[model samples]
Target: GLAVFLPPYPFRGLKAPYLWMFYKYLHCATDSILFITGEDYLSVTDDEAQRARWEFDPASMASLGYELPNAQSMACHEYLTLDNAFYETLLSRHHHDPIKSFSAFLTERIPDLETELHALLDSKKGIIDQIDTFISICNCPSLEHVARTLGKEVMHIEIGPLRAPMYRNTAYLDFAGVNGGTEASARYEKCQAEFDIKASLGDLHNYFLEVLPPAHSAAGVVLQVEDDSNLIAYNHDFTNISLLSYVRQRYEKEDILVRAHPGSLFRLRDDVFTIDDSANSLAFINQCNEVFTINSSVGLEAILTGKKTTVLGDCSYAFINELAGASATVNAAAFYLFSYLVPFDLVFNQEYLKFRLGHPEEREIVGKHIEFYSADHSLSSLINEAISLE
Candidate 1:
């Protein structure tokens, strides 16, 4: 049995695809789909109408193309602000499991979390006693660690690159998989000139440009800054300000430009060489001479785009320099072409997951469906290209 996590409002759109995938295409027995909502609506039709939460409807889904999943609503927002002090306390203890410690932190904060879940189980007659896998859309590792206590597996899903027309979503079968991705030297191995440098940056590029803050300047040694949530769990000592200070010490303060993450609220500088935080990173990475990041994927994307990428933190893509003999750069066209890059329109193929390209073991598992990714593939040729794939 499986437990699919349905994130709170606005993120509600994310649940639909998976709900249908597990129920219809995979035909798996998903024990529960847990959704987070307000306390007043815990059990009421009024609440259902207000939020339009999932209600299992066989007839409703039959017309739409998939079965309805059993959904349970609970109010719980697990926080992931574990710092070094917590780790120090753990080190002094007899046993230290960061996962367990984080789990305790979560349940203790929202005491009703487990209580609501258990209540749903008892009342619904349902609720499989053993859930083998837990499918989660968010990248919160603490919540994932808690899922391990409830289920054997956790499939972490997130929004990946090639957004907009290429509605590509990323998912993994491992627990902490998104943070530790599927990128590898072998995946990009073999004689490769590159996939398509001429890849139509097209609307994918424009989509980012449209929403981003328009004041971004493409100059100097640029650093793609990340939000605190990314750094909070790792090292309380490090921050965007500290990173800026270190770079200023190494190079001219004018030589540094900061491309900020979307959710950041801090004012890093006065002139704020840090460009519009919401600006398109791909745009800045394409223009900048030197790219630096603690561990932003822009550094990874910078490498692929043939820019000078300087990594400030630990990353899997960093090894491509020596391992692949690829000049501190990883073209990685083959991997994107065959495996990692899933087109926006191919959400259905997510479950199928193009097994024939990589992972020789998966070839026999679901080998019949083969999906190909071309850099030039976009909405301009949308109908022509899709006509054949379907």
Candidate 2:
């Protein structure tokens, strides 16, 4: 017997937190509770009196039936983060015990799952493949199909995104295990001492600033067109046609220059002046008085090149207001650190706990805006308490 709430296939990016929780606690007892709302999941046992914050301590996992692995000898160390190291260290601490290993534990608990996981792992499949296999195995949505599955007056809890340190790209859940933006941001921050972007890329940055006509001399606004796949909730007003129309209406006095992103599916609008994808992008950017993007990295480039930039959507680098004179120069590093380094787990836990405790403002960390829709105020505290139990 197992208690799980797997999201329907073609998983929306917003619902990823639920799937992540399901994957992490798949082996918990059949009687364990697994509940979901739009934004988060809660998994815990029935003993309310004994409930506590359930850290994923490997030793405790072994006691609960995990076949532990030797963490110290694992070859995957270099890639491990602080949390990953802690998890492995705890598992390794119990390796000397006589009874089990992860493989054996899973084999006994769910042979089919064990077989599938083993096959996938052994095949050396990439991250995408692993997710495909995992979803395929857990495709049944009977819990969602049946409202009374829990036999309680079940209600959904809405947990919004928490603000955290940014490192690489904006932190958001996707089909991949974790967004590469955060990981890339972490690596970039760590290697900053060895590579100086200002020293090496500074000339290019300055060249764009100096070569391009000054803002006062320019007559047009550069509209960077992003593809449909690049769309997110932040820029509800954007699309190639919609954005162009808005710009035409907003800056009716100035000339509008449209630069479509390479590989964009939609054709460029006929009314605006077009910049070829192969054209010197920086050169065109130089000619414009201002650059506009929904949330494209081109906005970062524009800032570095000393061009006025406006973002219509949420972005990690949108924290420009907080930085004054000197801070603006090293905005790249600041942007990465601010957006990516904070782990999703930490963000989820803090927000989940806060909402549950009925004090949502308890953890005030720093970062850009994260988009999420919260449930009614009446249900937030209840959902928080349920998740807080474990």
Candidate 3:
């Protein structure tokens, strides 16, 4: 038995103030620890006692910092757990044929897409550089961990075979090469630069609302579900907070409409379609009147789409002012303009904005580490060499 102890990864808010705690843990455990991973790792275990330690253990809770406010992002964590399960089932059940079949479909269909409406950008020109700006968003920690543990290499995309030649390369795809492969700093610069461009784009979507608003193009609602116990415990909530109960208490007086956040239970209460089964929340964020959240990435997506949104709890962007409390500004007509009049700032702008946000849809999170890359340094060759050794 490898006997590796996997620690709890609550979420991005775990707010690790310093790496010293990890160092201390390593020393105390005699570095006997084998693998520390994201909160998703807990799904690997079957035993309840051990699973608790891997996820909701009390000892690990004390090590968390205040900056990591676990309370706010609870809903998003639940969605991740469900998605992880679904994706795992998918990979395991259709590991070979389904994946190959899908790849073949994409590969064949993508190139001919808009073979006329779009023109390929020259990778060597400033266009390639502008296009490369969207690639850094592939800051996938999981991908990095995979290459590291397996001692394998990440394949880098060179200036060749473009995925799509038309429609401005609608969906950009790039790899987060292992260690030396992805340049963290340079990518950061591109992220910042791209954000500026997105900011100028302005309110690409309109009217975000937690409760329905008047004179809005559409209505938006976010129904959050307490999908996992570990997420609740990690957020220090032992009980699954009744979100429907909360929203009803706050907005029962307002018109209820367009719901965001696929993990929500609100629809069940109103006899509307269940978001639990709807995979189109990402698209909804773009097309809906406004977006709403009980602290989910949907709020962030709403903000990126230039819509008015509300956050029930504090999150990384909770203070960005784009999100307001449900009752505080629910009745105000001015709130609708926040979705339309305001500019849709590229909240997570970076080299990967194109892929992360997709063509003309809302700014969705398709990758990770939006702020972790460097704008000037090239880490591709370094990662290539490291992978070569493996």
Candidate 4:
């Protein structure tokens, strides 16, 4: 539920500082886990020159810790001219020794663990005696492997490309229910059957048919590039919404139509870029050639439809690149094993999610097996129970 802060690869753009500031707010505002320890990761602790500004400063070490051993001190070679030496350093470390690096990473990231503990503690404050049982299942393998293997951890959940659907089911349910009550629910249920994917395609085809200025016109494509806005600090990098600006730079003026995410900063930065607020993300994705994105959960939905994708940032599915150049006849491994592994580990698994700690109104609806929760018709007691732990 927290925003992971990943800047553009080169870190050459001036927008980096603004992006960083926005990420700071994203971390502060959300009641989710953060990815870094306080002393090392944060830069605004009175504004000293960032190690990133230095030529020798390896970007890999940026996410590791403030006082990591020097590249030369470690007898490391192969440092190239890329502004971010840390990237290569990380790649090198991941290849060399994965497990040891992962342990050190956990140790170094004490602050993140502390933040999580505190948030959990705050959520369930008081009402301790009224509760029973606290079970924590942490899927630390991803973090564990990266930390042990790399000698430092980047400290973020790398998972599927999340697709935030443009149309909310709640809205459609409302429209169908105009007659009100159970009749509305049935109306919406029938509407699902009436959704014309072919008609959607026909509309898409007509969009190109209405070409003007007639100078070798090209057809536009739609994609569900749901930037992982959760990893973004609402005020910081703006992972998804900011992509509108990035799209403007990458695509021709009229070659694409991004269905603006229902939740975006269109009001704040409308002049630079815009999305058609009315388009359905699911429908457009069904008819598109492929999707491109950082890590968005929607990417998982895309995979369900057998869609081809290109991940521009760290995602659970980004591991698809492991098969990037592999031969078909080489008895290839299943991409899903590594791709959706983390989410299956972190979210689906009962431990880390601690579903019992959430409100009954929220958790009970999913029907995720709750045998020993609910006090005063509430799960508030679980909060009090968990906070009692050290």
TM-score to native of every candidate shown = 0.52, 0.35, 0.31, 0.31
Model 4, 87-192: lDDT tens digits are 3443355563433333322233333433333343344444222222221111233333323432332222222232112211110001111111112223223222
RMSD of 1: 10.3
Q: Is candidate 1 or candidate 3 better by lDDT?
A: 1
Task: State the lDDT at 37 in candidate 3.
Answer: 28
Predicted structure with the largest lDDT when compared to the true one: 1
User: For model 4, what is the C-alpha lDDT against the true structure?
Assistant: 0.30
Give the candidates in order of TM-score, highest first.
Answer: 1, 2, 4, 3
> Best to worst by lDDT, what's the order?
1, 2, 3, 4
Q: Write the per-residue lDDT of candidate 1 for residues 1-390, one digit (tens) a residue.
A: 345554222111222323333333222222223332222222333444533534345553543345433342121211111123333464334156444443333223333344444444345454445344545544444445455555545555443433432223332232344433433444445323333222332312322222443321233343332332235333234556677776677666555666666534544555756553434666566556766666565655555555555655543355443334343132343233223433323332333423322334322221121333333233213322332332
Overall lDDT per candidate, in order of appearance: 0.40, 0.35, 0.31, 0.30
| lDDT of candidate model 2 versus the reference | 0.35
lDDT of 2 by residue, 279-383 (tens): 545556666787776656566566655566766665445444224544344534332332223323332333432332342221122111121211112122322
All-Cα superposition RMSD per candidate: 10.3, 20.5, 22.2, 19.0
Residue 109 displacement in candidate 3 (angstroms): 53
Q: Which stretches of candidate 2 lie over 4 Å from their true place?
A: 1-229, 269-280, 321-326, 329-390
TM-score of 3: 0.31
